[PDB]
């Protein structure tokens, strides 16, 4: 499958992960403003992180 991986508001980039049918967009606030980490798969997550898992290509924007 295909999914984004750029961090926060850097230009949209892609990462191809064959077979991985889900994707993720994690958001935590932190000291340095809203940080965002996108990637492949649907990961279990520590406390206080906005997780959003997704099912189509390049949908974790």
């Amino acid at each position, epitope marked *: 499958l295909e999914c984004h991986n750029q961090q926060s508001s850097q230009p949209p980039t892609t990462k191809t992960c064959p077979g991985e049918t*889900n994707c993720y967009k994690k958001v935590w606030r932190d000291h340095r403003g809203t940080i965002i980490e996108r990637g492949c798969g*649907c*990961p*279990t997550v520590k*406390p206080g992180i906005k*997780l*959003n*898992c997704c099912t189509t290509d390049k949908c974790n924007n």
Partner: nanobody
Amino acid sequence: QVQLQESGGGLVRPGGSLRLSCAVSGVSESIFANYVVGWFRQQDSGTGRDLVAQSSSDDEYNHVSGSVKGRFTISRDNAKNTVSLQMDNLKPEDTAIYICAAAIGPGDNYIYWGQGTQVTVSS
């Protein structure tokens, strides 16, 4: 094989409550204790699957999203193999399909996925 069965969907009047539950078939040995079992909410076109609650033995991987904090609560019967999500003071904004998922362990990816159950709050 592990397969996740949900139960408890339907229509709730605004302000009511309702308990979803997700039973992890497979691992019938009942040694799934640490499956990080997650509840996600899909509001159709708006947003994909939003993690609303995550249940693990590991504290850092057992919490609820701040949006629903105080209204939703998760419970676990590891022996009977069920992970329940009780929803109180249900608002219309909570109308969505709630899906269950299971990760093999804390920090691993949600590789198991559920059928989905609709919850409608409208009056």
